[PDB]
Amino acid sequence: EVPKEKEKEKVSTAVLSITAKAKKKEKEKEKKEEEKMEVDEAEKKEEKEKKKEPEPNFQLLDNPARVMPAQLKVLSMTETCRYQPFKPLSIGGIIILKDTSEDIEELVEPVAAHGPKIEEEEQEPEPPEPFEYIDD
Amino acid sequence: TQCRLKLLKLERIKDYLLMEEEFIRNQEQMKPLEEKQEEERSKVDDLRGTPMSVGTLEEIIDDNHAIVSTSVGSEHYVSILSFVDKDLLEPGCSVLLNHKVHAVIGVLMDDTDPLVTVMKVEKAPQETYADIGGLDNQIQEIKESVELPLTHPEYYEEMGIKPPKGVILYGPPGTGKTLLAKAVANQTSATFLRVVGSELIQKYLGDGPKLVRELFRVAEEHAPSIVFIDEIDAIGTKRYDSNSGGEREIQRTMLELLNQLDGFDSRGDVKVIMATNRIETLDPALIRPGRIDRKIEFPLPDEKTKKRIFQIHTSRMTLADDVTLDDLIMAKDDLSGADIKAICTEAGLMALRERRMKVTNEDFKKSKENVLYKKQEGTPEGLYL
Amino acid sequence: MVVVYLASLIRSVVALHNLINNKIANRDAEKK
Numbered sequence: 001e002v003p004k005e006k007e008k009e010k011v012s013t014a015v016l017s018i019t020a021k022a023k024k025k026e027k028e029k030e031k032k033e034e035e036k037m038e039v040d041e042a043e044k045k046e047e048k049e050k051k052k053e054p055e056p057n058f059q060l061l062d063n064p065a066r067v068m069p070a071q072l073k074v075l076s077m078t079e080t081c082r083y084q085p086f087k088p089l090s091i092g093g094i095i096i097l098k099d100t101s102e103d104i105e106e107l108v109e110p111v112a113a114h115g116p117k118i119e120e121e122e123q124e125p126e127p128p129e130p131f132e133y134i135d136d
Numbered sequence: 137t138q139c140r141l142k143l144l145k146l147e148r149i150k151d152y153l154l155m156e157e158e159f160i161r162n163q164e165q166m167k168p169l170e171e172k173q174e175e176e177r178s179k180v181d182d183l184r185g186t187p188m189s190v191g192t193l194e195e196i197i198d199d200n201h202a203i204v205s206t207s208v209g210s211e212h213y214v215s216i217l218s219f220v221d222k223d224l225l226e227p228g229c230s231v232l233l234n235h236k237v238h239a240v241i242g243v244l245m246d247d248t249d250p251l252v253t254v255m256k257v258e259k260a261p262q263e264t265y266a267d268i269g270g271l272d273n274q275i276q277e278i279k280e281s282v283e284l285p286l287t288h289p290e291y292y293e294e295m296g297i298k299p300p301k302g303v304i305l306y307g308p309p310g311t312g313k314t315l316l317a318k319a320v321a322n323q324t325s326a327t328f329l330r331v332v333g334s335e336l337i338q339k340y341l342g343d344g345p346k347l348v349r350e351l352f353r354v355a356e357e358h359a360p361s362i363v364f365i366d367e368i369d370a371i372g373t374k375r376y377d378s379n380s381g382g383e384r385e386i387q388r389t390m391l392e393l394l395n396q397l398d399g400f401d402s403r404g405d406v407k408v409i410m411a412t413n414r415i416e417t418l419d420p421a422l423i424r425p426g427r428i429d430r431k432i433e434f435p436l437p438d439e440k441t442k443k444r445i446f447q448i449h450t451s452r453m454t455l456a457d458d459v460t461l462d463d464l465i466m467a468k469d470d471l472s473g474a475d476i477k478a479i480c481t482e483a484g485l486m487a488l489r490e491r492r493m494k495v496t497n498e499d500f501k502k503s504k505e506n507v508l509y510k511k512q513e514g515t516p517e518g519l520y521l
Numbered sequence: 522m523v524v525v526y527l528a529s530l531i532r533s534v535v536a537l538h539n540l541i542n543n544k545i546a547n548r549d550a551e552k553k
Contacts, residue, residue, distance in 0.1 A: 011164055011165075011166070014163075014164045015160055015164045015165045018156075018159060018160035018163070018164065019157070019160055021156065022153050022156045022157055022160075025149065025152050025153070025156070026149055026152070026153050027149075028146065028149075
């Protein structure tokens, strides 16, 4: 989050919140019949909030999320939609013939290269792409 | 009633807004203060050294020293160094010393006397002005004598020479001598120190000349001021022993007053207001002018004055519009303020017995015949005299 | 030994019947 930026920000919102509350106790304009224009205020300012609790299947059990219902394909070369030590369990998951690299032997358990099914095509696989030689 | 109420409601509400606005300033809102002053405090407290051992700052020497008396029991000759200046220190105050090695860190705090706390009572009369009417001429005089030379300098400066230095309020109680002292003091807002005369004669000897000089000297320091000496008849009347009565005790107290008021030691434009119910006990030297200036005499209430004196007592209670004032003037007259208080109390007393919780004309009338007789009875009737 | 056993004897019926209702509750509660 980084602490410093919040501290400037907090002061601003807050000073307003308490000042608005000051205006609410103060009523004189219960009696009035104004249309002549200059005010046309309620002469009270207030604030409030409401928020909803939910967020779907947060954790399966008390322990971490692990396997969960609803299925995804995740492409390789993703670690901003990463593989986890919580995902060995997940792998398999009634895999499709649209995956041309699919299981053929067991599990790798925590990570490694895993079996790619006997390929007849290279449509799903993507060509070579190292960042090795552009580093320097 | 209804006319007042809209403004009353608004004043309480304006004050609410004022309270609530303070909270937002101490908690969130900062611009010069910031995180920065917080750190200034930490840094100053650690250098300064907590605990700070209290001293009293009697005087400052300009060379980077001060003469301090530490309040622990043994005094120290400290340096003025660290977070204070010579001028920043003020005389007769409490100061902070570094605990490890005493140098005077500074004056945040002021020192109040032990004496002054007991003596002092707050200024304001419970009977509002222009409703201590009745000897209405007399009420005005005190406002002219004690209050005015402090309130308005213009007349005095053109008049020239020495101003007033007191008033003496004398004559039978109930003509409101205490209410008057409090009024002038309220108006000026001069520290009102109050001591009963009986404190001047207590068991210990020489306490009288001691208390009175300290009281005045404290009034000069906290000046401008009003000293009220309430009911100085006790000097002769009281004795805890032979030494506490008698001439030595009476003289020493009188003698002190004479030097203090106009004499060598003098006083400033600080006024002494004396209440006395007897100037029989009081000397011709404290009834002498130019340390009393105008004396105020209250005489017994007159037939017409008595109706106005009665109104004041009636205002403190519930307001009458059904009491016959003539019956009171007819029954007794050329009797004190204290007699009008006596008619009022007795009416309240009969109503209390029934558990009637008001006074009416009826309560005043029933009680009034017994009270007049009772006045005569207060002084001995013996067997049949 | 006597004191505890007497406390146990009154508590028993209460504690043992309730167990089945709490047990079921726990398994469901755990998931969220």
